[PDB]
C-alpha cells in the first residue's frame, strides 16, 4: 500500500468488515486547513453515490447502504472547498463483507505410503469471502504434547513429529474477523489411516496396471463400463503386486470403454481415489 496523507478520516459502523447483507453507515469528516466545505461527496471505486447521504456536523457526512452484499469495495469522500471549483480528497477506506466460519467437519487425516506426511483435510463449509485462518491442533494420547499448525487450506504434518505414540487427537479451528469455530476431535491411529501407493493403468481385452506399494494385505477394485452405459461393473480383487497386475476382460468389438481402479490396505478405513479414466476403443 502506498501512503496517501488524508485531510480527514473515514469510519464505518458496524465496522469495516461486516456480515453480508447488513445495513452499514459510512462516515467522513473533513479536516482541511481553511475550508468549511460547501458539500461532501462519496464515491465507490470512482462512482458517485447520489442518495442516502446525510450532512451531520458542518464537517461530517454519512453514506448509508442497505443490504450490502459486495465482498469488497474501496470508498472515497471528497470536499467542495470554497475558493475552488475542484474537489479535495478527504480520505479513502476499504470495506469488505463476508460470513463467519462454519464449524469445520468431516475432519480426516491419512498417510499416503512413502510420503512421510500425514494429510489432514476437512470441509470448511460455507464460503466466508473474507480472510479466515485454520489452526490444526495435534495431541498425542500417549504424552499429551500439543502442536499447532497454521494453514489457509489443509495441512501436511511431517511423520517425524508424530513419533510420540500412535494414537493422536486432531481438531481444526477456524477464525476470521466475524467469528471463530472449532471442530469435534478426531482420534486416529497412525497404523489405521494408511493408503497404499497409487495404482496406475498403462496398456490396453487385457489391461496392465501396477503399484509400488509394499503393504502386506492389499485389496483392490477395478470397475469397467461402456463409455455410454451408466451402470459401473466392479470386479473386486485381493491383489499382490509381486509382479504386474494384468486383468482380462471380455468386451464387444467396435465400442469405446472406460476403466478405473482403486486399492486399500485390506480392512482399513479409507481407500485411495479412483484412477484417472483409461479409455479404450476396441477393434471390429
Amino acid at each position, epitope marked *: *500500500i*502506498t*501512503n*496517501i*496523507n488524508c*485531510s480527514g478520516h473515514i469510519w464505518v459502523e458496524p465496522a469495516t468488515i461486516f456480515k453480508m447483507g447488513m445495513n452499514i453507515s459510512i462516515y467522513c469528516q473533513a479536516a*482541511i*486547513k481553511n*475550508c468549511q466545505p460547501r458539500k461532501l461527496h462519496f*464515491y465507490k*471505486n*470512482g*462512482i*458517485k453515490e447520489r442518495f442516502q447521504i446525510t450532512r451531520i456536523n458542518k464537517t461530517t457526512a454519512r453514506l448509508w447502504y442497505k443490504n450490502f452484499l459486495e465482498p*469488497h469495495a*474501496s*470508498m*472515497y469522500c*471528497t470536499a467542495e*472547498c470554497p*475558493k*475552488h*471549483f*475542484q*474537489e*479535495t*480528497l478527504i480520505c*479513502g*477506506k*476499504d470495506i469488505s463483507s463476508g460470513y463467519p466460519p462454519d464449524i469445520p467437519d468431516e475432519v480426516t487425516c491419512v498417510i499416503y505410503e512413502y510420503s512421510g506426511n500425514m494429510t489432514c483435510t476437512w470441509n470448511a463449509g460455507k464460503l466466508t469471502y473474507i480472510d479466515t485462518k485454520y489452526v490444526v491442533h495435534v495431541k498425542s494420547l500417549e504424552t499429551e504434547e500439543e502442536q499447532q499448525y497454521l494453514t489457509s487450506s489443509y495441512i501436511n504434518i511431517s511423520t517425524d513429529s508424530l513419533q510420540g505414540g500412535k494414537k493422536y487427537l486432531v481438531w481444526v479451528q477456524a477464525a476470521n474477523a466475524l467469528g471463530m469455530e472449532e471442530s469435534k476431535q478426531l482420534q486416529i491411529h497412525l497404523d489405521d489411516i494408511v493408503i497404499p501407493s497409487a495404482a496406475v493403468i498403462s496398456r490396453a481385452t487385457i489391461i496392465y496396471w501396477d503399484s509400488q506399494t509394499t503393504i502386506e494385505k492389499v485389496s483392490c477394485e477395478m470397475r469397467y463400463k461402456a463409455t455410454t452405459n451408466q451402470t459401473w461393473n466392479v470386479k473386486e480383487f485381493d491383489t499382490n503386486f509381486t509382479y504386474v497386475q494384468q486383468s482380462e476382460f471380455y468386451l464387444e468389438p467396435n465400442i469405446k470403454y472406460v476403466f478405473q481402479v482403486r486399492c486399500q490396505e485390506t480392512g482399513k478405513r479409507y481407500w485411495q481415489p479412483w484412477s484417472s479414466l483409461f479409455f479404450h476403443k476396441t477393434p471390429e
Partner: nanobody
Amino acid sequence: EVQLVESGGGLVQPGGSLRLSCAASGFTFSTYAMAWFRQAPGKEREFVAESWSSGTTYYGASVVGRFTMSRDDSKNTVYLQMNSLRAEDTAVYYCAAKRPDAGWQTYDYWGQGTLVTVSS
C-alpha cells in the same frame, strides 16, 4: 509488460505553468484509476490528483485549484496542468495506475517520473 512514461518535465519560473503527460499501455485503461504523485527531495511521496474513466477527479489539498488533471481514454493518456507554480512544487512527478479491486491506496504500476524544477 505494462508501462507508464511521463513527459513535460523541465524548468519553470515561480508563477509559471506547464503540463505533464503520461502514456499508458499494457492494461485495460478504462477500468483503472490513474493518479499523479510527487516526491520532493528528502520529503515523502505525496498525492496530487487522481481521475477515473467515469470522470470523478479529486486532488490533494496542497495543489487543488492550482493543478488540474484530465484523462483521454482514447489516447490512453492522463495530463496534469500545473499553474501558479510555487517553489514548493519542485519535485519528481510520478504517474500511477490503481486496480479497482485492489485497495483504495495500492497502485500496481508506476512511471519512472519527470523532474519539475521551479527556479526563482
